[PDB]
Amino acid sequence: QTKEERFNPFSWYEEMRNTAPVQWDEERQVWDVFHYDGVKEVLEQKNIFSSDRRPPQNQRQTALGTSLINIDPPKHAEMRALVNKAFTPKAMKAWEPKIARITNELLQEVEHLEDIDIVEHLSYPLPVMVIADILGVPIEDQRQFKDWSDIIVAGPSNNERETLEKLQQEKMKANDELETYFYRIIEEKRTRPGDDIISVLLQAKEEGKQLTDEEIVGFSILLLIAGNETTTNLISNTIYCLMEDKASFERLKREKELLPSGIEEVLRYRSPVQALHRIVKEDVTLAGKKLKAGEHVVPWMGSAHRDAEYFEDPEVFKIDRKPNVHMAFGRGIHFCLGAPLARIEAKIMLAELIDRYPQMDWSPSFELKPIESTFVYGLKELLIRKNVHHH
């Protein structure tokens, strides 16, 4: 449809939530789940709704393919306990100054522009640079790291069938090069450990058990894929919400301590991840519908988040919303282990933007350019005028 309505899937969600919150789509071969309690049930009931998407033996065995997000317990629990040791508040204390520095570097790079793209200049590069730094990627390698990241999330330039195999081949090569890259870093950190996620993971032990090199490679790449574009879209979407609702913008500027809460409302209201994927392990009934083992389930957190039972005045952006029990980071055992990192990246960059440019507004040349996706909700660009030069 239009751009307006690529950035408004919520009307469709409301129709489906108020007619058949659990429904089979025969074309897509999935059960869509639209209502809060259904989405919550699907994500929490891991023994019924599987995350095991490990590729069969006759497909490529990437390290990513058996990484944390694609496995069920007991393996998932063992892996989770180990990688959790790298995402502590202790480690976060070391990450904040790095995030702040990178934020200041990015803002400085475009201080010469009155009109900037939030996406390209700020929210797109921040997560990439942060994750490279805290993983242990040395600064000299960081442009190659960024190029690999760009390829892994690129769209096709044209729809031609051959192009698609091209992009698919470039992504496979980026992944393979990233794997080779991280096996090397792991060797480096095995002899000269550092203050970085890879070093921490090399030393993590939980009941005698340790991560394999492969598992660390696959986790490192997973952090890229799971953490970059999502955090990007949280930051951009937050600016979009504030520019759309100037009263909230003004209020925020007077009550800095509201920013965390305002980000949580963005996580509810313009969720970077709209939906997830599960496979039914056993027959189950949900909203009176009979789901059969092996059938695919798509829970729509984006829709759960508009369910008035849990979010009064769901269509209203409330920077102080309470309660706000959203599932923007998932729910249950697969709950995003980067949620504190994403929250602080968004807080640090947004606070700096709001402090520096309290009069910012849409650029005159703003255009609504949504990411083309049903699972992902965000903007390809977001042109903002700082209003710190004259017109």
Ligand code: HEM
């Ligand atoms: C605002 C930004 C982000 C959002 C909305 C988000 C969203 C999510 C969601 C919805 C899940 C659950 C997926 C599922 O249950 O299958 C998840 C899991 C995960 N996220 Fe995030 N994420 C964000 C940022 C990050 C960052 C910054 C990192 C790390 C750098 C990260 C790493 C992960 C990992 C490793 C998992 C898998 C956990 C597991 O399977 O045990 N994410 N994320």
Ligand SMILES: C[C@]12C[C@H](O)[C@H]3[C@@H](CCC4=CC(=O)CC[C@@]43C)[C@@H]1CC[C@@H]2C(=O)CO
């Ligand atoms: C594993 C697959 C590729 C890739 O691995 C996916 C996975 C689905 C879940 C997932 C969430 C991410 O944020 C990283 C990629 C990823 C972990 C996919 C399921 C089918 C696909 C393949 O079988 C290989 O093409």
Ligand SMILES: C[C@]12C[C@H](O)[C@H]3[C@@H](CCC4=CC(=O)CC[C@@]43C)[C@@H]1CC[C@@H]2C(=O)CO
């Ligand atoms: C965001 C997810 C990871 C990653 O972001 C995916 C996205 C689906 C669209 C997409 C296409 C790409 O070629 C790069 C990654 C990516 C942009 C996925 C939707 C659910 C998944 C997660 O929720 C991981 O936590």
Ligand SMILES: C[C@]12C[C@H](O)[C@H]3[C@@H](CCC4=CC(=O)CC[C@@]43C)[C@@H]1CC[C@@H]2C(=O)CO
């Ligand atoms: C290309 C891969 C399969 C698939 O393409 C992935 C991609 C990584 C990002 C990604 C997230 C999604 O949810 C859609 C698929 C996808 C865009 C993966 C990188 C390694 C994997 C393979 O190399 C399997 O052959």
Ligand SMILES: C[C@]12C[C@H](O)[C@H]3[C@@H](CCC4=CC(=O)CC[C@@]43C)[C@@H]1CC[C@@H]2C(=O)CO
């Ligand atoms: C592609 C599917 C839809 C969606 O793309 C899924 C994908 C498997 C990988 C994956 C993990 C997530 O948590 C977000 C979406 C997603 C990347 C699914 C595999 C079968 C399913 C369909 O065939 C629906 O049409």
